[PDB]
């Protein structure tokens, strides 16, 4: 689809059996989700933004479905304000910025 | 132009006479420029980010030429690490997200 940015670009995701809303974030290299009790083995990652820092758990090869498209990447379950689908999953679904 | 998200969407902006590079951020409602000179008056404003909240100065009607395109809007000058061009300017230039 084509999303006009006058409205926050929140889309629906299905991850590990849970359904939650996530914002497509072109200014995010990584994807961060909160409240998703994910299975498996996890590594660390200290990721950062403006404000500073946040401690997240790095889970790899997690199946995540973004508005009907499936992609497999690195999902950081974190203490974030909103769910973020970063570029690492946006490239998978073929997301482009146009103007 | 169309931007592929494999690499960060960094575009050149001409702001207040200065040439700088900024990130086209769909997940940003506001634009923030890392501590640079902008002449005049301002309002306190504070907005949230992942891992925080930062104190910014709300400057209005600041001209920005985002990749030759002119746009006049709100630019916050603050302690941010990366310069962001949020939806308040991306809507003006007609930026959409596509997949
Ligand atoms: C603006 C900027 C700001 N947006 C962000 O901070 C968003 C996330 C968010 C949205 C809404 C509320 C809280 C957090 C994140 C930004 O896109 C930042 C921009 C950035 C890039 C590189 C280095 C440092 C910072 N990205 C980000 O935090 O994600 C990564 C994956 C890079 C950690 C915002 N939007 C709405 C209110 N504040």
Curated annotation (Swiss-Prot), chains A, B:
Regions crossing the membrane: none
Catalytic site: 25
Domain Peptidase A2 span(s) in chain numbering: 20-89
Region (Dimerization of protease): 1-5, 49-55, 88-99
Domain of life: Viruses
Main function: Aspartyl protease that mediates proteolytic cleavages of Gag and Gag-Pol polyproteins during or shortly after the release of the virion from the plasma membrane. Cleavages take place as an ordered, step-wise cascade to yield mature proteins. This process is called maturation. Displays maximal activity during the budding process just prior to particle release from the cell. Also cleaves Nef and Vif, probably concomitantly with viral structural proteins on maturation of virus particles. Hydrolyzes host EIF4GI and PABP1 in order to shut off the capped cellular mRNA translation.
Quaternary structure and partners: Homodimer, whose active site consists of two apposed aspartic acid residues.
Name used for this protein in its record: Protease
Source taxonomy: Viruses, Riboviria, Pararnavirae, Artverviricota, Revtraviricetes
Gene name of this polypeptide: gag-pol
């Amino acid at each position: 689809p084509q999303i006009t940015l006058w409205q926050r670009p929140l889309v629906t995701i299905k991850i590990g059996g849970q359904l939650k809303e996530a914002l497509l974030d072109t200014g995010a290299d990584d994807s961060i989700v909160a409240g998703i009790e994910l299975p498996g083995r996890w590594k660390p990652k200290m990721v950062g933004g403006i404000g500073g820092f946040i401690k997240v758990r790095q889970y790899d090869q997690i199946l995540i479905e973004i508005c009907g498209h499936k992609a497999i990447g690195t999902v950081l379950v974190g203490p974030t304000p909103i769910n973020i689908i970063g570029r690492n999953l946006l490239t998978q679904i073929g997301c482009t910025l146009n103007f």
